[PDB]
Design a protein around this ligand. Structure first.
Ligand code: 1YW
Ligand code: GLU
Ligand code: GLU
Ligand code: ZN
Ligand code: ZN
Ligand code: ZN
Lengths: 257, 258
């Protein structure tokens, strides 16, 4: 029975409305819940969905070099596979294995509707509207490491921002935009931004182009025997059109705005 | 040793320099994949030789003989050490060769001569006046051959049986057929190539509708080759440091004639 680490992040993994009357894997639904079922089916394994203990994606502590989040769970042998919106990055690919990507994304800007910001450049050029990112994820590192002038300017601002502009979860970033009467903008992956734009109260919007282009991968411990089969299953699901089918199911058929 | 790179003459990926005959070796060529090759080599610490695939093909396995042709075949039979090309990551290929994480995204798309009354694949499927086809021997063809979606099965049933053949030997041959056919031919090709041609003179083509699928190009190596790891890490590094996006702009949009 494969221990799968994943994260409560809509619409990837969500507790079902009636989750309290249900047990095990059946408590959960979402894109990655269906994806998990499919990968397991093709690789012929049984599995247990577990929600990452610390609620994080995964970053390395600069001082201890200890990994947190789903990454750390694989690295420390606490999970067998991570099936989640987990961004394929160079620092991570050095410690864990990733499948070929199952979904594309880029960093994007979420505003409360009516906010006068069209681009990352607009953000960078003003101080009235605060902005930040998720903690312990790939978006923060993009800004941390960027040498592109606009993104470096944005970073120099964000990291010294008082009070803090960073949030612990996506939901927190989104609620922060919604309650902030236009004075907070949130930097987050286009997948998540586009999902939220189609849900009530319909008061947010993605503006501008994506800042980069990347993908999510299924992740396994280095040298895991599961990595081969899991990668081939991602390629098969894509070619059968199932990945396209699932994006449609979870994003646009679940639309409200 | 010197790494033999297999690639293909496909704009804007690899093209002959205008003065190539007075130049030598790697210096004869230019394009997105020439720049990318130089950068991969640099970061992986290797010397290399660009070679154009002999049969000028991407790579398919013959149903009867079972031999792989194209750049895939050069890798499978040990003629090349790495392929650095707009080579689409597919399952059938990944079973015989290794791919890096993708360096560029694409989807199958439709190219029409301007003013052609077609907005989608569903439109193409529902009519016979305007003929349509694919490159004869790459991922786009095979996508249609295998597909179980009503619309694309319908399109395939038409293409495979259409006479004269709707399939072409090269991308350039597809594009010239669109341009010469007064709106009576539409070409199915990857979005990257379609969007490039859309920005070149005579500015008489365009991409219509959404992409039919989503996939990536990968750097390919022979299965279990020692280069594969360093190459994958270099692709991730070069994406993260903004080189791939810079190179896309340089070869598509900086060079735009329309
Ligand atoms: C592996 C595959 O074809 N997956 C289907 C889609 C395509 C995809 C993808 C993600 C990322 C990229 N990149 C990352 C950098 C530029 C292109 C890409 F080309 C394709 N993820 O999901
Ligand atoms: N997908 C990201 C988390 C979300 C974000 O950083 O915006 C990761 O793997 O770290
Ligand atoms: N990039 C494709 C070739 C072009 C096409 O099939 O449209 C391949 O690797 O086969
Ligand atoms: Zn399946
Ligand atoms: Zn610390
Ligand atoms: Zn470099």
């Amino acid at each position: 029975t494969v221990v799968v680490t994943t994260i409560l992040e809509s619409p990837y993994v969500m507790m079902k409305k009636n989750h309290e009357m249900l047990e095990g894997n059946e408590r959960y639904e979402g894109y990655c819940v269906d994806l998990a079922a499919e990968i397991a089916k093709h690789c012929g394994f049984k599995y247990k969905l577990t929600i990452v203990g610390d609620g994080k994606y995964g970053a390395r502590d600069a001082d201890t070099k200890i990994w947190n989040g789903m990454v750390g769970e694989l690295v420390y042998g606490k999970a067998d596979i991570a099936i989640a919106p987990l961004t394929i990055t160079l620092v991570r690919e050095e410690v864990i294995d990733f499948s070929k990507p199952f979904m594309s994304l880029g960093i994007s800007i979420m505003i409360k509707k009516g906010t006068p910001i069209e681009s990352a450049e607009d953000l960078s050029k003003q101080t009235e509207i605060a902005y930040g990112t998720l903690d312990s994820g790939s978006t923060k590192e993009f800004f941390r490491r960027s040498k592109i002038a606009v993104f470096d300017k944005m970073w120099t601002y964000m990291r010294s921002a008082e009070p803090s502009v960073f949030v612990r979860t996506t939901a927190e970033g989104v609620a922060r935009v919604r309650k902030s009467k236009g004075k907070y903008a949130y930097l987050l992956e286009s997948t998540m931004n586009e999902y939220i734009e189609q849900r009530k109260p319909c008061d947010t919007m993605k503006v501008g182009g994506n800042l980069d282009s990347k993908g999510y991968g299924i992740a396994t411990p280095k040298g895991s025997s599961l990595g081969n089969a899991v990668n081939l299953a991602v390629l098969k699901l894509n070619e059968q059109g199932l990945l396209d089918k699932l994006k449609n199911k979870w994003w646009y058929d679940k639309g409200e705005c």
